[PDB]
Amino acid sequence: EQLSFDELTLINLSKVVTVNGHEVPMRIKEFELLWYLASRENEVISKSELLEKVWGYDYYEDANTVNVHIHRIREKLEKESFTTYTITTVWGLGYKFERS
Secondary structure (H helix, E strand, O other): OEEEEOEEEEEOOOOEEEEOOEEOOOOHHHHHHHHHHHOOOOOEEOHHHHHHHHHOOOOOOOOOOHHHHHHHHHHHHHHOOOOOEEEEEEOOOEEEEEEO
């Protein structure tokens, strides 16, 4: 389907992210993680949950893999000057996609 938030839009079917119509390409886990959050605008999510759904129940890499990918997405967005929304780190609690 489709998700948009001002200049930004997310197309699941193709795993494409665009800002002002310009593709900001992203690896699949980055897109899928951002989709998850933006489907749930304004909800706080736990790293645990994020990793569980996005990377797998089984996923066994020992990293701040979620918290590395959040930063990655934010970098990518801010590069293209999208600011109106963001992922907010809610310390101790999880991650939030909402308006800046």
